[PDB]
Design a protein around this ligand. Structure first.
Ligand code: ZN
Ligand code: ZN
Ligand code: ZN
Ligand code: ZN
Lengths: 551, 551
């Protein structure tokens, strides 16, 4: 009755695509689903990656009975190297479940951060395994085709009912590794009755079905076969299926594959070791291939953190240290832009063409296919589960809304669909489902020096300047008061008002001296009036830095 | 032989979509094709619109024999209110040709800028007219279906051959005003021999044919008919065909049409007067409709300058003074985002859904169709003209390149295709076509106070701060030297280095005093060393504002 209710607390991945992490709780036992990162879009220079704030988990660490990872994509496990130490410290006994490849990639990262091997309790399971979590949760994972092998959804059985989480998925009828989705557990759950459905909303706006990775492999074979000279291919480091497809295409035309990008080299190494990747010869470095005929070279590349942008941007503008675009090169962008980078990629494409390269990119060219289900696939899942409650996930509000409308057009629509938000606390009972509160939530920014180096504050006033400009007022508080006003990125109309600013500042400074006021109070007497005056006369709110010095 | 060559100088519209203006010259006679503006993408706050720099025209004004306008879209005539006074002053005898609607909208704008009626010599012509320009140019305009009535291309006959300019176009088989494209002149030119083709590259990446404005009108009728309450529709003020379609849809379901947005009210007024728009009742204001049942109201709106963004952004965030979104409202974005605003619109869409509105937007919903030709239409034009030379225009580099590849796949590809750039000078002879130089070119920024208020400089260092932050060093040069260092939007790692900055600054200040150096030289002694030190220790180049005051 009362004590019977599951709490679902999303800390990332809701209303957005990235840094996925969802907390599940029944009474005093918790388990977490994934812990990803989010890549920063350009315009946020210096930032290497974003991670979810996990205050709630740091506070309730003792109640965490397990951490479950659905697959090895950066936005699902990418944050763990930072989050685990924040929650448990340098070590923990807590079971961290994941498939072979998922944990394989995770260890590569943990190790890379100085985390001792075996410091954390990683339990390798099958993509289709069943695991008991504490006294209240029985998890039945099921394999789903996606853009990385060993990907799962999970049927979450609780004391008050079943929750089906589709995980990230598409229903690829012909996956590159020959491992089709396993829907038995999902259909079965549907027939018994699904209380809540949490499903991938990425392509809820798209009619039809997502093309198979096999279609892309064949199209990649096609365009690479016709390439005159060198071929560059960019994609995420974790897109193992795409990488295999490229490798196959290269090998079909006698090309040797070189690889650039720390993360991708690392992940491919692991995939090769574990058997997920196969290469007839081997993977080379840029140097080892620098002297081969153009027609015999294919380069696979991505950014240092695993995303293509930084390397595409360098090939286009700043210039890359180990490689450079030349007329005749063929560049294939075999991935889609991170949300917020669409038009930054367009500029890269424009610039790449001007360098003389034949650029092939999506959606104009079929050199990429989403790793997520389109409407026909989502409808199949909706009918398979016919959930009482529905919580669209893995997508921005428009994606979530469109999935809601899609669900509402089914034979037996959900009793209710909530639009999930990060930090929201959802209460689920056998008969109800609602948001009952919130917990601290947000994002931490990471760069070469770790977390904290860059902050919301540093970014907030970085925009205040970018959009309004700067006005520096230098005041000398003494018996010989002096005021100097200078500005930057400020409107000319406003600049011509700096003389007036200077004078009203002097009066404030002189008056401040007379009253024997502290400098900070004199700073205020200057700041406020000047701020008011300027907006009242320009409609702009430039950043006003008043510096008052006694002397 | 020698003296025989036409010079084509693009000052805007090349390698981009917007602010179109192309200069044509033979010996000492010039004529200009259009003079548009470009809308600013968000991120460039304060800026109302962009205009082409016309130094070349201001210098050679005496040689200008005519100005020809192809249609009334803001990116073709929108800049004229600024450019004409810059080139000729308050008045000019120069013939400015354009169709009835084109000149109708132009006068509305000129008047709005204080330009006396008749100050400029506007010659109304038919969309299919023939006009003589000076001694060397004979222009044969031809009607082309587009997103505004009275739209033309032009066959430019010169002493060394024919140049076909498609103008902006698509081949709509069923235009809303029943005025189909007129291709006789184009096909005829093709049969006689076309020396150079200048064609609309907007959709050169798109296979097939662009949907008819009639398809959209019918789809708009469809979605508006099912709307429960109020309906908001956003689009450009100059999209007369779309406006008529919306008006028809509203009238079919007994809805009254209100209109918000100065520019759109102005343009619709003119269109109604001239007969291009028809309304069964009349157009109302927000107030006049504020008390009608939701189901009987349809609002047509756009930004003050004619673009939808500012009004969509206000309906979503800041809040609009005269109207507000409420649960149940239906909002239809019946236009595509300006280049660079795609993801800004996505945020608007997300926010609009969260306000409880049913949002319909392209491409997810067929509530908009491009006003430009897709590949099948472009191929038809290519075969119709089979030009010797080709100059893709009205699109960014990727659009231009794709059109080039498209041309190269034809039966008789052009002898050569050049990728046009703004400011480039192209020399055309009966046998050759090449870039032979450049002229000053660029963009001027316009806001409420006119041109110059915002500048490249103001923007350049506005980005330097946005991406690197600020470091203000305040130094008092006297016998009691004092140095204070403060920063904003600067990396914490760097901030912890402000103490060191402070000290190396003091030493520079004290040494400056000893040498009796001028303050500006002391500023340098501080600036440079500090700049070097910090990048050498953080890899960042923050803006360093050194302020040295004697006292
Ligand atoms: Zn994902
Ligand atoms: Zn994924
Ligand atoms: Zn145009
Ligand atoms: Zn146009």
């Amino acid at each position: 009755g009362p004590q019977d209710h599951v709490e679902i607390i999303p800390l990332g991945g809701m209303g957005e695509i990235g840094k996925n992490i969802t907390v599940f709780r029944f009474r005093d036992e918790i388990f977490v689903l994934d812990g990803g990162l989010a890549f920063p879009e350009e315009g946020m220079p210096g930032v290497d990656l974003l991670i979810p704030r996990v205050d709630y988990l740091i506070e309730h660490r003792h109640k965490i009975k397990a951490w479950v990872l659905t697959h090895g994509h950066e936005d699902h496990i990418g944050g763990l190297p930072f989050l685990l130490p924040m929650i448990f410290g340098k070590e923990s006994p807590v079971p961290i479940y994941g498939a072979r490849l998922t944990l394989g990639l995770l260890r590569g990262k943990l190790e890379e951060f100085g985390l001792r091997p075996g410091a954390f309790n990683l339990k390798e399971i099958s993509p289709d395994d069943r695991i008991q979590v504490g006294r209240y949760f029985t998890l039945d994972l099921f394999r789903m085709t996606h853009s990385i092998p060993d990907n799962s959804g999970v049927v979450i059985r609780t004391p008050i009912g079943t929750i089906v989480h589709t995980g990230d998925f598409k229903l690829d009828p012909t996956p590159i590794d020959g491992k089709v989705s396993h829907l038995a557990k999902v259909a079965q759950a549907g027939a018994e009755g699904v209380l809540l459905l949490i499903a991938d909303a990425t392509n809820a706006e798209r009619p039809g079905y997502t093309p198979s990775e096999m279609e892309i492999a064949k199209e990649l074979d096609r365009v690479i076969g016709r390439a005159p000279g060198r071929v560059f291919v960019t994609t995420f480091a974790s897109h193992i299926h795409r990488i295999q497809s490229v490798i196959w295409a290269a090998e079909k035309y006698g090309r040797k594959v070189a690889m650039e990008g720390r993360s991708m080299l690392k992940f491919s190494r692991i995939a090769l070791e574990l058997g997920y990747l196969k290469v007839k010869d081997r993977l080379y470095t840029l140097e080892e291939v620098k002297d081969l005929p153009d027609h015999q070279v294919l380069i696979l590349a991505t950014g240092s953190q695993g995303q293509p942008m930084s390397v595409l941007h360098r090939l286009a503008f700043e210039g890359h240290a180990k490689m450079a675009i030349k007329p005749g090169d063929t560049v294939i962008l075999s991935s889609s832009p991170i949300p917020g980078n669409e038009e930054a990629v367009n500029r890269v494409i424009n610039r790449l063409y001007a360098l003389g390269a034949y650029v092939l990119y999506p959606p104009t060219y079929k050199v990429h296919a989403s790793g997520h289900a389109s409407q026909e696939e989502l409808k199949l899942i909706l009918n398979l589960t016919t959930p009482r409650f529905f919580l669209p996930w893995h997508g921005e509000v428009r994606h979530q809304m469109n999935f809601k409308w899609l669900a509402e057009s089914m034979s037996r629509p959900p009793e209710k669909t909530l639009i999930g938000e990060n930090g929201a606390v959802y209460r689920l009972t056998r008969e109800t489902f609602e948001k009952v509160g919130e917990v601290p939530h947000g994002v931490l920014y990471v760069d070469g020096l770790g977390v904290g180096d860059i902050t919301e504050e540093i970014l907030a006033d970085r925009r205040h300047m970018a959009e309004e400009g700067l006005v520096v007022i230098t005041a000398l508080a003494g018996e010989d008061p002096v005021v100097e006003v200078v500005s930057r990125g400020f409107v000319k109309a406003g600049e011509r008002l700096l003389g007036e600013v200077r004078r009203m500042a002097l009066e404030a400074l002189k008056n401040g001296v007379r009253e024997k006021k502290p400098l900070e109070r004199i700073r205020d007497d200057i700041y406020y009036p000047v701020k008011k005056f300027l907006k009242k006369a320009t409609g702009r709110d430039p950043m006003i830095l008043p510096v008052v010095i006694e002397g």
